[PDB]
Design a protein around this ligand. Structure first.
Ligand code: NA
Ligand code: NA
Length: 87
């Protein structure tokens, strides 16, 4: 399925997108991570349900110096995205 996750907290400017991309690639997932102008990070990830749960473990922690306060999740059908990009 597709996970669309919205990450709140001290998350921009701390390498969060690169962190997500590394773990998504480790977990066989495709999609993207993008900074939002309201201060959040949006993560779209497509792939197996358990891999999405493993990614969520990382999304809730973030890199060194991130302070992730919450991760809102919503699920939808995969669209066939390839690769994992940062925007
Ligand atoms: Na980054
Ligand atoms: Na961005």
């Amino acid at each position: 399925m597709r996970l669309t996750a919205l990450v709140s907290g001290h998350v921009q400017g701390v390498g969060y997108r690169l962190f997500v991309q590394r773990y998504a690639r480790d977990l066989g997932l495709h999609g993207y991570a993008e900074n939002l102008s309201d201060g959040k990070v949006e993560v779209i990830a497509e792939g197996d349900e358990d891999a999405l749960n493993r990614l969520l473990h990382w999304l809730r922690r973030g890199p060194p110096h991130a302070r992730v306060q919450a991760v809102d999740t919503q699920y939808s059908e995969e669209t066939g995205l390839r690769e994992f990009h940062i925007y």
